[PDB]
């Protein structure tokens, strides 16, 4: 029995009031929140999958780049590509900063992020779950030996398949896969434990910059109690879900507007242009 929309929650004014009153908010983010930072998303015309279709045409499809059964067959394309998506030196967006402030004020239950760019950490968001893992560690496909990212980093930027140092040198599949979640893999245990704790505590869900096309993250809106209000902030509507309020557009533009309506420290996040103040 899927989640219907609440008839009594509709407007941007309603959204502001909820942000004012709610104190256990889940923010579910996807690649859209980093687009303004200079990191393209996955599924848009200028995104990762479109690029992969051009730069790696031999793949059965762009998704195969992040598919565990394909990686097992041939990990060479991924290690040719991985440095392109390795965390760089980008600055967090306004949306990241907004989420960080909510957490600072004690109002953020969790930021479930699908991104591997680590910008939530840079922004000082603490209550993060990296749903789709990260490059922070790597794990041998065969024996599950773990290493820190610095152990495979050199190989990654040299576009070479890093080798397990424990397994036999003649074991073909003894390769160190960074612990980014691929299609066909489990999400980190942290995700499942956090969701079990959070689902009956959340009092507001805000989805920002995601197409919610991948499970189980895409199941979050239907897994929480139906009465919990849901707000979408995204360039595109999500026709497969029933949000209460749909704010469609650039997420920094929309969050900027919400921040000014909230006032207090939220308006202060938007330091450009400069507001009226005494020197």
């Amino acid at each position: 029995h899927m989640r219907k929309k609440r008839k009594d929650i509709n407007t941007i004014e309603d959204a502001v009031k909820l942000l004012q009153e709610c104190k256990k908010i889940i923010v579910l983010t996807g690649a859209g929140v980093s687009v303004s930072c200079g990191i393209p998303d996955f599924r848009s015309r200028d995104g990762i999958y479109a690029r992969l279709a051009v730069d790696f045409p031999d793949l059965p499809d762009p998704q195969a780049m992040f598919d565990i059964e394909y990686f097992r067959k041939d990990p060479r394309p991924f290690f040719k590509f991985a440095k392109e998506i390795y965390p760089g030196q980008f600055q967090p967006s306004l949306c990241h900063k907004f989420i960080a402030l909510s957490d600072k004020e004690g109002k953020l239950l969790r930021n479930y992020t699908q991104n591997i760019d680590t910008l939530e950490q840079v922004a000082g968001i603490q209550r993060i779950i990296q749903c789709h893992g990260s490059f922070a560690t790597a794990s041998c496909l065969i024996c599950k030996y773990k290493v820190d990212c610095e152990a495979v980093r050199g190989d990654i930027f040299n576009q070479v398949v890093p080798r397990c140092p424990r397994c036999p040198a003649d074991e073909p599949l003894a390769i160190m896969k960074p612990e980014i979640v691929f299609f066909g893999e489990n999400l980190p245990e942290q995700f499942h434990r956090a969701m079990k704790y959070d689902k009956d505590e959340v009092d507001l869900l805000i989805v920002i910059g995601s197409s919610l096309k991948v499970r189980p993250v895409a199941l979050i809106p239907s897994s929480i109690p139906h009465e919990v209000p849901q707000i979408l902030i995204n360039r595109e509507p999500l026709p497969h879900l029933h949000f209460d309020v749909e704010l469609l557009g650039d997420c920094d533009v929309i969050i900027n507007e919400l921040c000014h309506r909230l006032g207090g420290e939220y308006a202060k996040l938007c330091c450009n242009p400069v507001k009226l103040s005494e020197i």
Partner: peptide
């Protein structure tokens, strides 16, 4: 910020269209 960044187009009861919405694309 962008042209008319603080304005939206409203489709009642609950949809707001801001700068950058994909609906503006061709």
């Amino acid at each position: 910020g962008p042209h008319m960044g603080s304005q939206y187009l409203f489709l009642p009861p609950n949809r707001y269209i801001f700068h950058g919405a994909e609906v503006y694309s061709d």
